[PDB]
């Protein structure tokens, strides 16, 4: 039930796959972010927890050119650093 | 519960990296939603609408579109294209 407002870079990512608002729940941000990775085909086909984002907005958001979705702490770190809690 | 997808559904799952011929229902649903997003078949504005024209998914559904809100229709489509173990 916590509402967040993504900062411009994160908001640009969500809007690129159809997000229409400025305010979201954390669960909604996670849904769109996973949608972004699949829509842009950034996951490894063989070991599908690996994401390659070096030439992508996601990599600017993460601070690294690749990561594994198993790094839950890093994912939450990136998201919370790029939003404003309401 | 284990299911074995029929050839066409198996072809779809394999196109997004599925490696087996036997799965749980949850795994099939995960890969199927992944397929729709990876192939960008959802409507950008009303994202419960999925477009299946000229796509493997349209053969599986027998229809050129469907709504994700139609849960019974989705399960009907899936169960018609697998064999429960």
């Amino acid at each position: 039930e916590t509402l967040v407002r993504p900062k411009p870079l994160l908001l640009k990512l969500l809007k690129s796959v159809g997000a229409q608002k400025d305010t979201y729940t954390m669960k909604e941000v996670l849904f769109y972010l996973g949608q972004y990775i699949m829509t842009k085909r950034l996951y490894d086909e063989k070991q599908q927890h690996i994401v390659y984002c070096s030439n992508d907005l996601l990599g600017d958001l993460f601070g690294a050119p690749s990561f594994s979705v198993k790094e839950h702490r890093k994912i939450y770190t990136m998201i919370y650093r790029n939003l404003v809690v309401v | 519960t284990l299911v074995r997808p029929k050839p066409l559904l198996l072809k779809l799952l394999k196109s997004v990296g599925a490696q087996k011929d036997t799965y749980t229902m949850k795994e099939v649903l995960f890969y199927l939603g992944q397929y729709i997003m990876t192939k960008r078949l959802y409507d950008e504005k009303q994202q419960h609408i999925v477009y299946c024209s000229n796509d493997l998914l349209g053969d599986l559904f027998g229809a050129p579109s469907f709504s994700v809100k139609e849960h019974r229709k989705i399960y009907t489509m899936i169960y018609r294209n697998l064999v429960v173990v």
Binding site: L30, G34, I37, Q48, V69, I75, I79 | F30
Partner: peptide
């Protein structure tokens, strides 16, 4: 394991 399931286990 699909990316979707991996992602569902950070939504």
């Amino acid at each position: 394991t699909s990316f979707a399931e991996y992602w569902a286990x950070x939504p």
